[PDB]
Amino acid sequence: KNVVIYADGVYDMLHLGHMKQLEQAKKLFENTTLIVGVTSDNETKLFKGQVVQTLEERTETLKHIRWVDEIISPCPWVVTPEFLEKYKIDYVAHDDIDIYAWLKRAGKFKATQRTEGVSTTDLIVRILK
């Protein structure tokens, strides 16, 4: 009955958008375990960009989120089939903007919706009045 969901990301400076994505993930099915993978500092910087918070900081904040059942920190950048088997993961949840083609082909991808305009750094903009 219980379904293992895996959501990965940077989760830098956690904001409402991240938290809403985690809720979506958690709620994909009636009974779930939500595993969150947090990407490493150097892989993020290498492939995505400067991260503000360290892995240790980004991971500690996620510990406090209601939807998060388990954390894999650091997590591998690219998910692989072996990785899915190691953690008995049933679905991978992430926004969908193809690195996730093979998961969609397998029926293992559950797209989640971004919520724009609610990023921490949008808030700094508001501080600027």
Ligand X SMILES: Nc1ccn([C@@H]2O[C@@H](COP(=O)(O)OP(=O)(O)OP(=O)(O)O)[C@@H](O)[C@H]2O)c(=O)n1
Interface residues toward a second copy, by CB under 8 A: 13, 16, 19, 22-23, 52-53, 57, 60-61, 64-68, 120, 123-124, 126-127
The reply to whether 65 sits near ligand X by the rule CB under 6 A is: no
- Binding segment for Mn ion (CB under 5 A), chosen from 9-17, 60-68, 91-99, 117-125, is 9-17
**For residue 113, which of 96, 98, 126 has the smallest C-alpha distance?**
96
48 has binding-site annotation:
yes
SS3 15: coil
Give the contacts of 122 (CB within 8 A, at least 6 positions apart): none
The reply to whether 61 sits near ligand X by the rule CB under 6 A is: no
Q: Which residues pair with 92 in a beta bridge?
A: 6, 109
The reply to whether 51 sits near Mn ion by the rule CB under 5 A is: no
Name the minimum Å distance from CB 59 to ligand X.
13
**For residue 12, which of 47, 60, 46 has the smallest C-alpha distance?**
60
The residue type of 108 is K
The residue (of 61 and 77) whose beta carbon lies closer to a second copy is 61
Q: Which of 6, 11, 67, 91 binds ligand X (CB under 6 A)?
A: 11
CB atoms within 10 A of CB 127: 6
